[PDB]
Structures are given as structure tokens and as C-alpha cells.
Swiss-Prot record:
Lineage: Eukaryota, Metazoa, Chordata, Craniata, Vertebrata
S-S pairs: none
Tissue specificity field: Widely expressed in hematopoietic cells but not in other cell types. Found in the spleen and lung.
Protein task: Couples tyrosine kinase signals with the activation of the Rho/Rac GTPases, thus leading to cell differentiation and/or proliferation.
Naturally occurring in which organism (per UniProt): Mus musculus
Shown residues in whole-protein numbering: 168 to 375 of 845
Protein's recorded name: Proto-oncogene vav
Length: 208
């Protein structure tokens, strides 16, 4: 809901330079290519939190608490980088319709979003206090994030981003099945929905 607005600005998307015929607005048709394209750029920033952040961040934020701030960004960076590594061969592969195989077995990690949103929801909340608490941190996140987004969606808004992914995932995937007149795709692609959609109810249902 709110996270959607993030990806828009967080990544070169919201702004669409209208050229002589053909415009990003066509994304509605490129949706598929968008799944990988959008993920790509995001991956660049997704991994940025790995080194270009945690290291400089530790300069102020305690080591013990630091584990709660970022959470599992490290292993989470794979879910993004690896995801594209699959779609690449899945899309260009003998049959794009097989993309499902990439969505059916990814639950393992896509589920991470669950426990992730459990410490995250508490982590992002901590930053709000931490930053305001230690000025040394407030200014840090500003510059440290300058590499990703000058205090626009830093951590507090970042770790929360993926919370919309898993959701829009199956959702977007539906836009295709409903607008994909193929032989196996229109069908098999549906199988991916059942799986992905299966998380939306597990991810948004943690304990209580």
C-alpha cells in the first residue's frame, strides 16, 4: 500500500521521460520485463546495504543492536540478486511460461519476508528513535544513504520495502495471466499465482 510509493521514487520509475513514440507508460505490457528490470536496479541498492552501510553504520550504532536494525539484509540481498539470475534463463529459456518454477520454489526465501517483517517492523521503528536520539546517527544516515537515496527511504523505509514485494509479486503475476493469451503460459503461469498468493496470507499473519 504505502511501500509501493517507495519503489517509485526509490528507483528511477516515477519519472518518465516521454520520447518520440514509446514510453515507460507501456510498462503495463512490459510488466514481465519489468519484474526483472525493476528488480535489477533495486538489487544495486539492495546489496549496497551489505557493505556500503553496515560498516559505516557500526561506527555509531552498537554491534549487538545493529543486528536488529538491518536484520537479515545480508542473506536477503541474495533473494533479490539470485531471483534475477533465474528469471534471466527462465525468460529467455526455452519457455518463459516456466517462470513458475522460479516462483514455486522461492517460497523458502519469500517466506523470509515473514520473520523479516517481524524484526524489521521493530527495527525501522528503532531508527526513528535512534536517529533522533544520537545526532551522530541522524547525520550519518543522511550521508551514508547518499549512495542509495539522500535520506529519502533510508533503512527505516528500505527494509520495509520488501514488505510490498511479496504482495505485488503474485498480484503483478496476475496481470499477466489475465493479459497473457498463450498455450501453457496462460495456464501454468496460474500455478505460480497459487503459490505466491499462498504467502500473502502467511506473511501477513505472524503470531497475531
Amino acid at each position: 500500500m504505502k511501500g509501493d510509493e517507495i519503489y517509485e521514487d526509490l528507483m528511477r520509475l516515477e519519472s518518465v521521460p516521454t520520447p518520440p513514440k514509446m514510453t515507460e507508460y507501456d510498462k503495463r505490457c512490459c510488466c514481465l520485463r519489468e519484474i526483472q528490470q525493476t528488480e535489477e536496479k533495486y538489487t544495486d541498492t539492495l546489496g549496497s546495504i551489505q557493505q556500503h552501510f553496515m560498516k559505516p553504520l557500526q561506527r555509531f550504532l552498537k554491534p549487538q543492536d545493529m543486528e536488529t536494525i538491518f536484520v537479515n539484509i545480508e542473506e536477503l540481498f541474495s533473494v533479490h540478486t539470485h531471483f534475477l539470475k533465474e528469471l534471466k534463463d527462465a525468460l529467455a529459456g526455452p519457455g518463459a511460461t516456466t517462470l513458475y518454477q522460479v516462483f514455486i520454489k522461492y517460497k523458502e526465501r519469500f517466506l523470509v519476508y515473514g520473520r523479516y517483517c517481524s524484526q524489521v517492523e521493530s527495527a525501522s521503528k528503532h531508527l526513528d528513535q535512534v536517529a533522533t536520539a544520537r545526532e551522530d546517527v541522524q547525520m550519518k544516515l543522511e550521508e551514508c544513504s547518499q549512495r542509495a537515496n539522500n535520506g529519502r527511504f533510508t533503512l527505516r523505509d528500505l527494509l520495509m520495502v520488501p514488505m510490498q514485494r511479496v504482495l505485488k509479486y503474485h498480484l503483478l503475476l496476475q496481470e499477466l495471466v489475465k493479459h497473457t493469451q498463450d498455450a501453457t503460459e496462460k495456464e501454468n503461469l496460474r500455478l505460480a499465482l497459487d503459490a505466491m498468493r499462498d504467502l500473502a496470507q502467511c506473511v501477513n499473519e505472524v503470531k497475531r
